Design an enzyme around this catalytic site. Structure first.
Site, PDB file in Angstrom:
ATOM      1  CE1 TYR A  37      10.218  32.945  12.660  1.00 49.54           C
ATOM      2  CE2 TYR A  37      11.197  34.974  13.469  1.00 49.54           C
ATOM      3  CZ  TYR A  37      11.303  33.635  13.164  1.00 49.54           C
ATOM      4  OH  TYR A  37      12.500  32.980  13.361  1.00 49.54           O
ATOM      5  CB  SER A  53      13.892  33.347  16.596  1.00 41.99           C
ATOM      6  OG  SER A  53      14.386  34.571  16.085  1.00 41.99           O
TER       7      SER A  53
END
Lengths: 244, 252, 245, 247
Positions: free
Chosen positions: B155, B142
């Protein structure tokens, strides 16, 4: 109707391999050369042998801004422009303590000033067309990590990396995507285990860099902008703790 | 005439994984499909992969309960007899404020977002080493491998960890010609909008002003898995529409 | 008087940090894993500078229980203003055959411990409403891989990402969160010129060269620094395949 | 011998605060000014009010390479040099599409060509003395991230970031440590309040002391293991991405 790509210094090396690959993908190629014009003629014929139009022109980026007007002329020969690949010249070593000021300024002229002027001319035409565009600047791993005895080359590569981010941000409204490809060691035009300092232990072939440039110019790269893609065989991974 | 190379794409029942599997099958790869709970979606991927004349094998992969769930990679390898590509696709992101996060929620996010990739990469790399023909591993991270996501500290930390694992795997497996890279995507369109084609202007905080289609990420993943990417290893390729460029000085 | 808790301050960087924060006027909370009398040496040297010093046993190898000692150490002072999460020892293990529990245990002590300690420390700072400082000791391998230590590298990257998240989520409470990324650190015996020619400075770093920056990030002049990883490494990050010692 | 530190553009702003903090740490200060000669005298007086010697000289970086010779003159007054701080000039905006080629080159002159020539002069003298040295370049967060409508300023800050890494690598065997400090938004000299810039996480610009203090630390003896780095002091500027919602 056919999209047009201008690849500077496409007479030999990485530029020529990029021009061939952009012709494979269906681009009409504008070839540029500094001296090796026969090498450019070879590139033009190999592009025409693919069933695509190829135009050549001389462009001297060591004298600016005059030497950059050849991009304007090449664009007029096609009537449109879609892709500009600003290719990188050769690297010169010069110790920092005694480097002449004009040698420092000349490296910036060749390694960032030329790309700046060529990108301005390209970006203008792409804004008129309103169909988007792609500008790819060829940098180096030394956009990110210093090359010993080459402070001016390292600083100019960092400047071109910063220009890439800036261009990508200011042109994002016109769908002009601007990215950099940062090659590691590139094999010579004449050319396994020969460079053990690199994790992959060899220089990279031109097609291993030119292919990523070609991808950045094509349809599926339509969400990639502002980035510096490093193709270096692991070069950036080798710190003092790395023993080959 | 060379034997058909096989590629395993985890979580390829929908989204980035589904599109990657199709584009890899377009490049001549036999596909190992993986599904967490949407078994029907994985059968749709297999049908579309088979529609291109490629073999498709699917299996259930439960990366929430490790190390047992990672054994499904061994089973897919047994069906094909070989392995050339592994794509570690990312699970969904869940938010939780940093101050009030249970330690088990923190551990569970690492289980699904880096522990699963670690275990699957071991099995895959072991097979590629035994074959002596090289291989490719692509970790889907990401933009938050590099920049924080507010209210998603676990995350973000796990994405950073997978980024560090990506570099280590690249350095440690390079002598086997196993190249390991990350693709770091920005905002991705939900499957309702991804299939609808064209949502311009829907995310003005992002410079390109929209989320990305799965095809715009999967295409780079597929390039990293093919022959031309033979000099690319240890890197994190960001496909984000300018997300990383947008700082407090950016005006939508 | 402000209170600074420094983990693993019985020796090494943690101790030098604890002493430098004491010269800067902080009361010091000392933490020890096994060397209790080494921690008392730190407490005694902190008290020789007019500051209060307390010690407690902290073992982050077993969580969430092992992190409760931070909560207890906070109760002795009543207030907390600075938390320094020190970095334990590095253990190598090849990636292909590394056991799964070895992988999980490295994440336990090298990022899970810092998570719980920072969570407790940040909770206390929010209630006081006077801000705070959290400094995580990472490594150069937060940014570049260490051969044969993939789990160490991944966990150091993770603690780097947690540092940015904590900095962003806590900025409205004036809790500034940063990391210090040391290169090679000399052992307590050596704490030499030319011993590590691979590193550009040709030598490891002394603990005072790392702890001084940690102490700076904890004082009032660092009031505009948050979310960053300051690398102190003698040029380690500069040495690429083109560097020839 | 009293160690000597030259701080370019120390007549006002960050360069002024850096000079006063370096004087507080015991440095004799060489002051440089582009046009505010009275500001450089004020800086010289405030430096002397802490028991330190101060020397001022005109430095015109808009005309090189002879303009940088003022550093060689400033060294001759002290006889030695220990640290050099290359402070940044002002920032000017210019759209990319229509920016004149000379304005582009002028920005590179003031923002990296000056620091290059000054660093050559300083580094040579530090090699003669053989007693180590410090060079600190004041860049910007835009050494790392683009500033809208300021491509030349961004490119030049990146360039100075690259020069910092190169200098640190080539000068390391002489114990000359080279680093950068990358400030975010700095408050104007009149304001040098809370919540005035909600786009930044700390919701305010930084004070000059908040930046100069780290510059001063990089010049002192405890920073002897730090080289080749860019220390970002930005109130979390770099943390703010499209997902940041200002409270």
């Amino acid at each position: 109707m056919t999209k047009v790509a201008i690849v500077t210094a496409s007479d030999s090396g990485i530029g020529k391999t990029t021009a061939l690959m952009l012709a494979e993908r269906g681009f009409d190629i504008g070839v540029t050369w500094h001296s090796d014009e026969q090498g450019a003629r070879d590139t033009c014929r190999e592009v025409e042998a693919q069933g695509r139009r190829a135009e050549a022109i001389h462009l001297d980026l060591s004298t600016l801004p005059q030497g950059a007007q050849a991009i304007e002329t090449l664009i007029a020969r096609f009537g449109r422009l879609d892709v500009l690949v600003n290719n990188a010249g050769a690297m010169t070593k010069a110790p920092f303590l005694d480097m002449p000021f004009d040698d420092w300024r000349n490296i910036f002229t060749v390694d960032v000033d030329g790309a700046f002027l060529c990108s301005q001319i390209a970006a203008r035409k792409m804004v008129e067309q309103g169909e988007g565009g792609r500008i790819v600047n060829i940098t180096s791993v030394h956009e990110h990590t210093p090359l010993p005895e080459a402070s001016a080359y390292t600083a100019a590569k960092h400047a071109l990396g910063g220009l890439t981010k800036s261009m990508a941000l200011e042109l994002v409204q016109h769908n002009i995507l601007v990215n950099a490809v940062a090659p590691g060691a590139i094999a010579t035009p004449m050319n396994e285990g020969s460079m053990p300092a690199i994790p992959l232990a060899r220089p990279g072939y031109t097609k291993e860099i030119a292919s990523l440039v070609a991808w950045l110019c094509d349809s599926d790269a339509s969400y990639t902008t502002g980035q510096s893609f490093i193709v270096d065989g692991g070069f950036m991974l080798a710190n003092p703790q790395f023993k080959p």
